[PDB]
PDB file of N, CA and C (backbone and C1' of nucleotides) in Angstrom:
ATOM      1  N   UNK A   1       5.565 -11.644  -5.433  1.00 17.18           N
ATOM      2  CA  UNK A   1       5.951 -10.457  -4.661  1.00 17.18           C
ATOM      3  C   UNK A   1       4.705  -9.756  -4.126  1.00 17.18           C
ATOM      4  N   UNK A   2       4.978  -8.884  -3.097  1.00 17.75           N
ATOM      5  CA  UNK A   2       4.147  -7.611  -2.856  1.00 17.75           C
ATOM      6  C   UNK A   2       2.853  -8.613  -2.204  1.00 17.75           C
ATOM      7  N   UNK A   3       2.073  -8.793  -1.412  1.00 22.07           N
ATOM      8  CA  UNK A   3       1.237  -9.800  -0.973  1.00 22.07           C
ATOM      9  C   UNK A   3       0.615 -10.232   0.450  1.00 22.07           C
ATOM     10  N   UNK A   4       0.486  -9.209   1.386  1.00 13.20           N
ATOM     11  CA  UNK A   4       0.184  -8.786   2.780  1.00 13.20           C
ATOM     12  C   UNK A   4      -0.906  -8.318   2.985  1.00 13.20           C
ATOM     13  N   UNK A   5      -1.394  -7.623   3.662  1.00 14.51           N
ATOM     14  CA  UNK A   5      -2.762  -6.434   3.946  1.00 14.51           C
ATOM     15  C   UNK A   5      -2.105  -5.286   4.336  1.00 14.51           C
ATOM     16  N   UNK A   6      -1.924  -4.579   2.982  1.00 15.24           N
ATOM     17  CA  UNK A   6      -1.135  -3.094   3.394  1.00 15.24           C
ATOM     18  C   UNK A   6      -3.030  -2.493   2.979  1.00 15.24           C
ATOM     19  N   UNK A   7      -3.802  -2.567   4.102  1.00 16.62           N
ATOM     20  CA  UNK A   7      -5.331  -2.139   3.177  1.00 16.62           C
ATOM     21  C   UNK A   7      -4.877  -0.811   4.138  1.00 16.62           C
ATOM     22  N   UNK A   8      -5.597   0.212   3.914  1.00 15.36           N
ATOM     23  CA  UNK A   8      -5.512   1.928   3.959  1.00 15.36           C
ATOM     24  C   UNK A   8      -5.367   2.053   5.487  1.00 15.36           C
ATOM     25  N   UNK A   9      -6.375   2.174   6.134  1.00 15.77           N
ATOM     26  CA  UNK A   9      -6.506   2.129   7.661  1.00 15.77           C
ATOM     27  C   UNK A   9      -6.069   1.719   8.277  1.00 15.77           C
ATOM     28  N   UNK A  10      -5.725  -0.352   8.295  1.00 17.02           N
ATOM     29  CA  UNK A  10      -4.718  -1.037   8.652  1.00 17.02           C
ATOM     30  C   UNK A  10      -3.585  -0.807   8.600  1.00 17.02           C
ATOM     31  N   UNK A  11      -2.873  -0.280   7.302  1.00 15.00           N
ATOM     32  CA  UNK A  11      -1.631   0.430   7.134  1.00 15.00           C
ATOM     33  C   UNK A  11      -1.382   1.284   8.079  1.00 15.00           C
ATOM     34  N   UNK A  12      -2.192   2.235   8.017  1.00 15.26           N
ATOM     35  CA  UNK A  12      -2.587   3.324   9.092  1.00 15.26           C
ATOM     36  C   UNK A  12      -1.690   2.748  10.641  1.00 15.26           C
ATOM     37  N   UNK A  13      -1.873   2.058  11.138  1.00 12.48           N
ATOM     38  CA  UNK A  13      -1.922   1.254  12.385  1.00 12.48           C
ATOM     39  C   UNK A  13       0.241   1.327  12.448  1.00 12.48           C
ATOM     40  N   UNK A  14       0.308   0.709  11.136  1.00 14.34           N
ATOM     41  CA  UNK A  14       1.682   0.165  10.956  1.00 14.34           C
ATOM     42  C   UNK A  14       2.614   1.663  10.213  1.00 14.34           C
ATOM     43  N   UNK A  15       2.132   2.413   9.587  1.00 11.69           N
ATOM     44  CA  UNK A  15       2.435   3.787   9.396  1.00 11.69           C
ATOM     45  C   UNK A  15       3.039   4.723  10.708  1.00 11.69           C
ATOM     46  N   UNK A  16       2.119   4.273  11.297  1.00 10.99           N
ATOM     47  CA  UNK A  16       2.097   5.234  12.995  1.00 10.99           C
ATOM     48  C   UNK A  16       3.254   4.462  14.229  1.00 10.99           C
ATOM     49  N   UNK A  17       3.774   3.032  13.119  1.00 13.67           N
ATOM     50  CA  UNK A  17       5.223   2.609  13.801  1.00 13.67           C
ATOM     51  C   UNK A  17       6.780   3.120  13.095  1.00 13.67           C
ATOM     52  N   UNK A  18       6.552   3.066  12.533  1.00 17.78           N
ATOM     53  CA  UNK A  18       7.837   4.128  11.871  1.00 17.78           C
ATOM     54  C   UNK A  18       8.298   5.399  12.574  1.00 17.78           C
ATOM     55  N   UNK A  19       7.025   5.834  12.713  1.00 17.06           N
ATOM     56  CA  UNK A  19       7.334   7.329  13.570  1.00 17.06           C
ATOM     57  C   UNK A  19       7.684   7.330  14.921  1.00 17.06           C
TER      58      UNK A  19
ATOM     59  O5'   G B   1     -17.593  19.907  15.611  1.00 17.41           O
ATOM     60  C5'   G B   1     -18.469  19.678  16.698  1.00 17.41           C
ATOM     61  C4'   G B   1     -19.199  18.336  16.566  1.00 17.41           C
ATOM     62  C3'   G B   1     -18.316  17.083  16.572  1.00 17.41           C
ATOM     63  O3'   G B   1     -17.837  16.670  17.852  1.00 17.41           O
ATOM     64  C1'   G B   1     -20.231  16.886  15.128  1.00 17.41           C
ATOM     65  P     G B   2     -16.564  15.707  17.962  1.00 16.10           P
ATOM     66  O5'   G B   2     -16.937  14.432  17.098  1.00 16.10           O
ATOM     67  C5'   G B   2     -17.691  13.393  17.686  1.00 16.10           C
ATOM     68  C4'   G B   2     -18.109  12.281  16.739  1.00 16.10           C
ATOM     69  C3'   G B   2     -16.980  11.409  16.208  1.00 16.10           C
ATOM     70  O3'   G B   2     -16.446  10.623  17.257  1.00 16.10           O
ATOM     71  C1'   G B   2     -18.816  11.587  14.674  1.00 16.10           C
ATOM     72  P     U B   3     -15.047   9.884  17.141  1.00 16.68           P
ATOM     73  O5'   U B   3     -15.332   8.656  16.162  1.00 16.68           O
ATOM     74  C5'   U B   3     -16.038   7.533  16.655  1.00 16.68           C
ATOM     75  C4'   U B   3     -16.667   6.651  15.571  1.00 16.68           C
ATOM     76  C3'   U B   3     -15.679   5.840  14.759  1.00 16.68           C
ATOM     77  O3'   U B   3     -15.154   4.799  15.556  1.00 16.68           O
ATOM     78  C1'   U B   3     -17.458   6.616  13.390  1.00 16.68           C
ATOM     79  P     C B   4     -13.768   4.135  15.207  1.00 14.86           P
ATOM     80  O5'   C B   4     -14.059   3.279  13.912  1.00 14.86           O
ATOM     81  C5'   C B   4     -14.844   2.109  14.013  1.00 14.86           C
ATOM     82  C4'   C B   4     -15.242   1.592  12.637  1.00 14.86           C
ATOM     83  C3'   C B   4     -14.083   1.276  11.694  1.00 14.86           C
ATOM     84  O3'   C B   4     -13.523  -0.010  11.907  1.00 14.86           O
ATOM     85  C1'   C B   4     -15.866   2.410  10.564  1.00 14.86           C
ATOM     86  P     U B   5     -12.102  -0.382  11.286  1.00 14.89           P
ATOM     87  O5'   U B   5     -12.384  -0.574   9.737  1.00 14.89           O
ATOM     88  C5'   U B   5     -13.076  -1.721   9.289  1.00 14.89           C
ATOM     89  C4'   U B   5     -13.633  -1.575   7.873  1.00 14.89           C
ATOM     90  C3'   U B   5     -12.601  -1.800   6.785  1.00 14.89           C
ATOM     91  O3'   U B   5     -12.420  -3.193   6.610  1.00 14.89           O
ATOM     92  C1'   U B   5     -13.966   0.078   6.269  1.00 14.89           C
ATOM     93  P     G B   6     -10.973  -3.798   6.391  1.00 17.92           P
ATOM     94  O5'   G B   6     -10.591  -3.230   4.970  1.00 17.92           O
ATOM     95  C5'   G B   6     -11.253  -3.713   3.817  1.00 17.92           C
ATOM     96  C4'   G B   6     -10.793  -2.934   2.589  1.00 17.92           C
ATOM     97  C3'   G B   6      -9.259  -2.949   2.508  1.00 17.92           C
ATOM     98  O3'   G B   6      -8.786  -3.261   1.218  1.00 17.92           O
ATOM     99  C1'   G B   6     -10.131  -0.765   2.344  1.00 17.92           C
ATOM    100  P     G B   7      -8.726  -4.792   0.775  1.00 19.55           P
ATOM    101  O5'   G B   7      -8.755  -4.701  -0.816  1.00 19.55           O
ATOM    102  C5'   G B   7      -9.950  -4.380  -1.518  1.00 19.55           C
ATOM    103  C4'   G B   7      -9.740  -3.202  -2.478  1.00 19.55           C
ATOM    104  C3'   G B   7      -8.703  -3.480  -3.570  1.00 19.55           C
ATOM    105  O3'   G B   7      -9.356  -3.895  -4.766  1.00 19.55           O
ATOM    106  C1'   G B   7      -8.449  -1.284  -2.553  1.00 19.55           C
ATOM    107  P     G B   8      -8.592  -4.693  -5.923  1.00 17.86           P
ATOM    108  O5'   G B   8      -7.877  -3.530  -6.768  1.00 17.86           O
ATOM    109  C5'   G B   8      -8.469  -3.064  -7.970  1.00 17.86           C
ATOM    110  C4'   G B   8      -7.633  -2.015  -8.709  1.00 17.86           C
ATOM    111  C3'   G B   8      -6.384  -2.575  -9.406  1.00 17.86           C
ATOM    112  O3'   G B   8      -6.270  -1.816 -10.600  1.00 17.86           O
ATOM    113  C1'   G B   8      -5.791  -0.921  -7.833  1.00 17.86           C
ATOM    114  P     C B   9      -5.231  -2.130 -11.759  1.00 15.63           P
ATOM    115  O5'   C B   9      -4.099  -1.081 -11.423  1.00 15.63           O
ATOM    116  C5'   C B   9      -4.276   0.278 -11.763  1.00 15.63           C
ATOM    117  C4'   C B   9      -3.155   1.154 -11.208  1.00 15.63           C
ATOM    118  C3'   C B   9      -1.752   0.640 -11.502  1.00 15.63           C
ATOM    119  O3'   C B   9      -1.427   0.796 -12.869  1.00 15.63           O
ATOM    120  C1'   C B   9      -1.912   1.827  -9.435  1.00 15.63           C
ATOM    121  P     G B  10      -0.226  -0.004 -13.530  1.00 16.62           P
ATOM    122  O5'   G B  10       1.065   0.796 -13.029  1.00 16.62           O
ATOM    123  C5'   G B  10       1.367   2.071 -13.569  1.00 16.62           C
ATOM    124  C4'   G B  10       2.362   2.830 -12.685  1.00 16.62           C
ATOM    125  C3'   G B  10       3.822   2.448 -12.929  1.00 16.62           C
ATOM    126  O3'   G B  10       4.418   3.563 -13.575  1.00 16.62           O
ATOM    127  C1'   G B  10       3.290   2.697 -10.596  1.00 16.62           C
ATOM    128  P     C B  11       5.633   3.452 -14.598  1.00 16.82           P
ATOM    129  O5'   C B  11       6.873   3.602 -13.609  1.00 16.82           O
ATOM    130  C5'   C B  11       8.085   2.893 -13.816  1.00 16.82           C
ATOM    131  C4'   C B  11       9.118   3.378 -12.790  1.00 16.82           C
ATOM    132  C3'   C B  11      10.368   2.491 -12.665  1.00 16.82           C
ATOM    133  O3'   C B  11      11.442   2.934 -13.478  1.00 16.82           O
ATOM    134  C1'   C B  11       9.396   2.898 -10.517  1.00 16.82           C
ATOM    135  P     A B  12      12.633   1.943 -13.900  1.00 15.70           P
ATOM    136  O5'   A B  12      13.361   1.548 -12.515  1.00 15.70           O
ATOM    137  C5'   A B  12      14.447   2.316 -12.021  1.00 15.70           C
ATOM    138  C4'   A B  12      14.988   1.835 -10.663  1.00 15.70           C
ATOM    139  C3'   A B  12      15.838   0.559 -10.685  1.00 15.70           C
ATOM    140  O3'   A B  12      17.213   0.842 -10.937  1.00 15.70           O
ATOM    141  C1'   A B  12      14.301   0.591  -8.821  1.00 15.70           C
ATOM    142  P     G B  13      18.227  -0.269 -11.499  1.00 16.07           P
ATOM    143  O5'   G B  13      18.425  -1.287 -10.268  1.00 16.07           O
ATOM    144  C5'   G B  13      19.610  -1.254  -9.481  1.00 16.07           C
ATOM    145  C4'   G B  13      19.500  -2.087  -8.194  1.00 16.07           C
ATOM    146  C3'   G B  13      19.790  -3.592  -8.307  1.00 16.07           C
ATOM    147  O3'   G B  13      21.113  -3.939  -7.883  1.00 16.07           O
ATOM    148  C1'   G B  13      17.744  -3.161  -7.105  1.00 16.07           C
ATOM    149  P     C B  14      22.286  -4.339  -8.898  1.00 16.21           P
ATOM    150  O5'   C B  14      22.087  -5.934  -9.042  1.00 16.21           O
ATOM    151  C5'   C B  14      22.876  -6.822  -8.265  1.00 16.21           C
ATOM    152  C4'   C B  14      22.414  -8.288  -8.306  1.00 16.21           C
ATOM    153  C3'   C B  14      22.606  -9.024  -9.639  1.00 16.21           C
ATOM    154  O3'   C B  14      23.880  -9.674  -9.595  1.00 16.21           O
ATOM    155  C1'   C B  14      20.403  -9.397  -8.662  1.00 16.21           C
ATOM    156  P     G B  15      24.517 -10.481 -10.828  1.00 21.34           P
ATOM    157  O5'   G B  15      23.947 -11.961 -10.585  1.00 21.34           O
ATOM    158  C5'   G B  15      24.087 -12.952 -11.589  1.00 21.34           C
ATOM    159  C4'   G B  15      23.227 -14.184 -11.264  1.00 21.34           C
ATOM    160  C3'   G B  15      23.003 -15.072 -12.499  1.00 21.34           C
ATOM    161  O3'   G B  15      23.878 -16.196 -12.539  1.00 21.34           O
ATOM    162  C1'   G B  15      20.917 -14.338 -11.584  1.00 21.34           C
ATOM    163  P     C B  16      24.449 -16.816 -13.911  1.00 23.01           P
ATOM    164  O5'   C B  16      23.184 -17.394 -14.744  1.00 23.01           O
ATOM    165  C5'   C B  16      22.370 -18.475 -14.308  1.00 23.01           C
ATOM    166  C4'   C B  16      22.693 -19.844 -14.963  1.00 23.01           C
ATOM    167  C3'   C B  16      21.569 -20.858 -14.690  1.00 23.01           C
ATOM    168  O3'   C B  16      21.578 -21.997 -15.550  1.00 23.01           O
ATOM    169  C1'   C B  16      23.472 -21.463 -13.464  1.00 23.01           C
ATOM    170  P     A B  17      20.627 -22.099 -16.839  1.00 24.29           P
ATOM    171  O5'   A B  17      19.193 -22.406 -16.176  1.00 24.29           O
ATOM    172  C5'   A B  17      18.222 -21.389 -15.955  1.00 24.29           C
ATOM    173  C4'   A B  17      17.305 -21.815 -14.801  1.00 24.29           C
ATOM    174  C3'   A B  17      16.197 -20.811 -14.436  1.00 24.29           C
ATOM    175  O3'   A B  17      14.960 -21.039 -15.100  1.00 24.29           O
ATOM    176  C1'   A B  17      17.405 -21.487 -12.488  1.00 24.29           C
ATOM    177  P     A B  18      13.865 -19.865 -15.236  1.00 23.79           P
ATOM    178  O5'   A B  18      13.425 -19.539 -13.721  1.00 23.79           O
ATOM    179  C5'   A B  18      12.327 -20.190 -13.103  1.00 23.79           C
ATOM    180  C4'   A B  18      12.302 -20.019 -11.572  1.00 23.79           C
ATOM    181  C3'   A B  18      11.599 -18.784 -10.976  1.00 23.79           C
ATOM    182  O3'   A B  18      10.227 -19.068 -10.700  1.00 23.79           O
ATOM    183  C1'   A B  18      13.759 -19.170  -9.955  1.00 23.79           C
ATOM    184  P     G B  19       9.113 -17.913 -10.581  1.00 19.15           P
ATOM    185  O5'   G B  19       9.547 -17.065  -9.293  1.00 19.15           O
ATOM    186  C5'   G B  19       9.232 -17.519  -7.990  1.00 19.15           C
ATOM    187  C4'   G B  19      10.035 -16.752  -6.936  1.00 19.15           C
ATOM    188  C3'   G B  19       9.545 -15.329  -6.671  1.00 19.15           C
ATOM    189  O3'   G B  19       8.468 -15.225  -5.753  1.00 19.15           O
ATOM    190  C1'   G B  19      11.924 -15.375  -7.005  1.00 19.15           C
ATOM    191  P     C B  20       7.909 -13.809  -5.272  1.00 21.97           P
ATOM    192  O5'   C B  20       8.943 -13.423  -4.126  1.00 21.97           O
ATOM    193  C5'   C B  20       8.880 -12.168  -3.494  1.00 21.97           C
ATOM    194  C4'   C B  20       9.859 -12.081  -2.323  1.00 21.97           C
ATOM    195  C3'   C B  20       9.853 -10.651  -1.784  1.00 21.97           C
ATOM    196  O3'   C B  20       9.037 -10.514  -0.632  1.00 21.97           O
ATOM    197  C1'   C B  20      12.011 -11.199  -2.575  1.00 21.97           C
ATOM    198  P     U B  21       7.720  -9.605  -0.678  1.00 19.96           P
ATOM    199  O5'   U B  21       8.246  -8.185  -0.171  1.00 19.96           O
ATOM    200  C5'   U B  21       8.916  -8.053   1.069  1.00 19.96           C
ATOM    201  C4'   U B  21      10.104  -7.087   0.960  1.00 19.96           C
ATOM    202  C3'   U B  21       9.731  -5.620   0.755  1.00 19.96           C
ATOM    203  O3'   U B  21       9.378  -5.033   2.009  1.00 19.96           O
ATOM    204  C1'   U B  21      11.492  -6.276  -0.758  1.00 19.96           C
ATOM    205  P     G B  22       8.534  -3.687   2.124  1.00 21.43           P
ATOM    206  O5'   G B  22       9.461  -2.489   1.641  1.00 21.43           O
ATOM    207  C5'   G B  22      10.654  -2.131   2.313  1.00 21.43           C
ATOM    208  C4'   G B  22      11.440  -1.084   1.501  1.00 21.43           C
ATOM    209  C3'   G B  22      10.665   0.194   1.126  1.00 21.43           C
ATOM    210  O3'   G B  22      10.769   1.265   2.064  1.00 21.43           O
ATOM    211  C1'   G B  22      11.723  -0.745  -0.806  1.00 21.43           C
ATOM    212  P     A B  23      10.300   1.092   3.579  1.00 20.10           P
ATOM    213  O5'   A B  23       9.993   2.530   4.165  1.00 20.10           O
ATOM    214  C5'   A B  23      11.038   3.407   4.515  1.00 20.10           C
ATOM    215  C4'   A B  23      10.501   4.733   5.078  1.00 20.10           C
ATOM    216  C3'   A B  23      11.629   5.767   5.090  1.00 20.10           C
ATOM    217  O3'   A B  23      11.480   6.775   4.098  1.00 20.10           O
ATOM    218  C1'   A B  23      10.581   5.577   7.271  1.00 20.10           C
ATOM    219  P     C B  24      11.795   6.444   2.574  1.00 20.49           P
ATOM    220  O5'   C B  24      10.623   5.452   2.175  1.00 20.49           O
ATOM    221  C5'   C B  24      10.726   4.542   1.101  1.00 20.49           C
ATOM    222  C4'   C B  24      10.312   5.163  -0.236  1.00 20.49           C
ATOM    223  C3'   C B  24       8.854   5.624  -0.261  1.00 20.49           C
ATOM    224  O3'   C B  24       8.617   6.904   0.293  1.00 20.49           O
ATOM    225  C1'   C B  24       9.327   4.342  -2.177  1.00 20.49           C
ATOM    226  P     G B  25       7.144   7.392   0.658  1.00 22.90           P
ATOM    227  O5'   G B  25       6.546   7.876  -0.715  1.00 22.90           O
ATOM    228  C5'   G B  25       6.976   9.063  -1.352  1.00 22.90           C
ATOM    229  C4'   G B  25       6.226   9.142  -2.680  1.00 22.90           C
ATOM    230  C3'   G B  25       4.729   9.331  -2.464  1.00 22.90           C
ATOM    231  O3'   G B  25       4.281  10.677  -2.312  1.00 22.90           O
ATOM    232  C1'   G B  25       5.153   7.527  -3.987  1.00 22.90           C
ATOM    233  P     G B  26       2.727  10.988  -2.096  1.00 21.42           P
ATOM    234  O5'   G B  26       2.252   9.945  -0.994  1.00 21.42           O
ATOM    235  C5'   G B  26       2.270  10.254   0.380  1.00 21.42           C
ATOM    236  C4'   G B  26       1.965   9.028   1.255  1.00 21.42           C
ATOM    237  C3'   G B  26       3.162   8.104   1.472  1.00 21.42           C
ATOM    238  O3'   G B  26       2.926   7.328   2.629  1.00 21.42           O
ATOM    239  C1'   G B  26       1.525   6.976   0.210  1.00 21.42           C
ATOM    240  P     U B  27       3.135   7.849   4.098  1.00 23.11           P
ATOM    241  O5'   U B  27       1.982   8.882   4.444  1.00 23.11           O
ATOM    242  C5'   U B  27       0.749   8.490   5.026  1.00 23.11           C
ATOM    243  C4'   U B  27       0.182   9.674   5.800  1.00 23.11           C
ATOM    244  C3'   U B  27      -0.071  10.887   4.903  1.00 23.11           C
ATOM    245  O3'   U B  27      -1.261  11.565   5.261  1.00 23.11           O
ATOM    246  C1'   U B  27       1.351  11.441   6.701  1.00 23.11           C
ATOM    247  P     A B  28      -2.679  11.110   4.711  1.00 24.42           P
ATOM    248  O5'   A B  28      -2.526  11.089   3.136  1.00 24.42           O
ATOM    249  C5'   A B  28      -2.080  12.223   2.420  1.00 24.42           C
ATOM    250  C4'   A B  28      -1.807  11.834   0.966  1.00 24.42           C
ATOM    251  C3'   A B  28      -3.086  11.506   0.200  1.00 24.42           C
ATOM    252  O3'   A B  28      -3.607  12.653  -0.440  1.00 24.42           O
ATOM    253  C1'   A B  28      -1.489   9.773  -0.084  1.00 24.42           C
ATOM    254  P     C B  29      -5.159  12.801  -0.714  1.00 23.61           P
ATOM    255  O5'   C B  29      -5.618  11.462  -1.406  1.00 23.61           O
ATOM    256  C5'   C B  29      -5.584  11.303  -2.802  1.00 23.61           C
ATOM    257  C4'   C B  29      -6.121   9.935  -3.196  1.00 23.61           C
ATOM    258  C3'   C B  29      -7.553   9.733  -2.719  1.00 23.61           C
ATOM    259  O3'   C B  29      -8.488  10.424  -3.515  1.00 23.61           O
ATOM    260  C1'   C B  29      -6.284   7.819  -2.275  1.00 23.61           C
ATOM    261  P     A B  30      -9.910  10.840  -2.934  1.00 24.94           P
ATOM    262  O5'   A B  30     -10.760   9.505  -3.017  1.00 24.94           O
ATOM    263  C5'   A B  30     -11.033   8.898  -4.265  1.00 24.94           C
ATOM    264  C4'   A B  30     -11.569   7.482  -4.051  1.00 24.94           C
ATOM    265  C3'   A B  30     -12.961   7.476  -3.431  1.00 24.94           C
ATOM    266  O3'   A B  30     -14.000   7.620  -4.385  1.00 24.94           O
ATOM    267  C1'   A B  30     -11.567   5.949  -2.300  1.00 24.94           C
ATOM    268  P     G B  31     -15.389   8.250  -3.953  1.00 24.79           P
ATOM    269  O5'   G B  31     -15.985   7.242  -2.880  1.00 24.79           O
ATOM    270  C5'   G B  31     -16.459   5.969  -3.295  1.00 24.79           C
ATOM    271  C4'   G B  31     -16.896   5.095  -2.122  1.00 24.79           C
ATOM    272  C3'   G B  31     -18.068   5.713  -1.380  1.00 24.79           C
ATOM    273  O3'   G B  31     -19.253   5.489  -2.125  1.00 24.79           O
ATOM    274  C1'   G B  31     -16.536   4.660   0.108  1.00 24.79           C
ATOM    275  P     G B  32     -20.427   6.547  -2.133  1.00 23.05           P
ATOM    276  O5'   G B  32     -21.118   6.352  -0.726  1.00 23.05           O
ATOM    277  C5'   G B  32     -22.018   5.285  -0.542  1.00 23.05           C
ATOM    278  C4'   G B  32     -22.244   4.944   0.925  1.00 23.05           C
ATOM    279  C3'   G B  32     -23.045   5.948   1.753  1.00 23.05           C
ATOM    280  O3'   G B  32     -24.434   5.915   1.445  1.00 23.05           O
ATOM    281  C1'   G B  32     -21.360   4.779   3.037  1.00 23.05           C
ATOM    282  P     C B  33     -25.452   7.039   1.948  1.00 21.80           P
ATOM    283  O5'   C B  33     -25.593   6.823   3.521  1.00 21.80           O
ATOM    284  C5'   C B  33     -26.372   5.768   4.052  1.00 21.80           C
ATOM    285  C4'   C B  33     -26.076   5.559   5.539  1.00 21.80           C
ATOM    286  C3'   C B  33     -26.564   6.682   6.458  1.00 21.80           C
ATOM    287  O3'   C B  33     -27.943   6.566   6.798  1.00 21.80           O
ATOM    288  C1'   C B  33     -24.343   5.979   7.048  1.00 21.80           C
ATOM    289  P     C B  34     -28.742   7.802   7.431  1.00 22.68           P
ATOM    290  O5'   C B  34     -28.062   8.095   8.840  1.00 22.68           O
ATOM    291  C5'   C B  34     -28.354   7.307   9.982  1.00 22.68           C
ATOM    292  C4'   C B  34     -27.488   7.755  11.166  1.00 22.68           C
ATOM    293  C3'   C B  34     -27.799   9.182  11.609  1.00 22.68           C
ATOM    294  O3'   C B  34     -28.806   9.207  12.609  1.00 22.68           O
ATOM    295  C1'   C B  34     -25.422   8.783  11.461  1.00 22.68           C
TER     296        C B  34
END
RNA sequence: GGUCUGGGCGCAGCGCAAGCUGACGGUACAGGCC
């Protein structure tokens, strides 16, 4: 399980698609 | 005044046998230079 690049900043990127 | 990186940590859902994810925490949190 659990096993991607959720890394901070990158997340960042994919965070700012939700919204 | 300004830029770039990104990691280890915890709760729930279903089984003949095994194994996912969570506008879940986290819009958080850490680090260095200029």
């Amino acid at each position: 399980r659990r096993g991607s690049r959720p890394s901070g900043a990158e997340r960042r990127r994919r965070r700012a698609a939700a919204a």
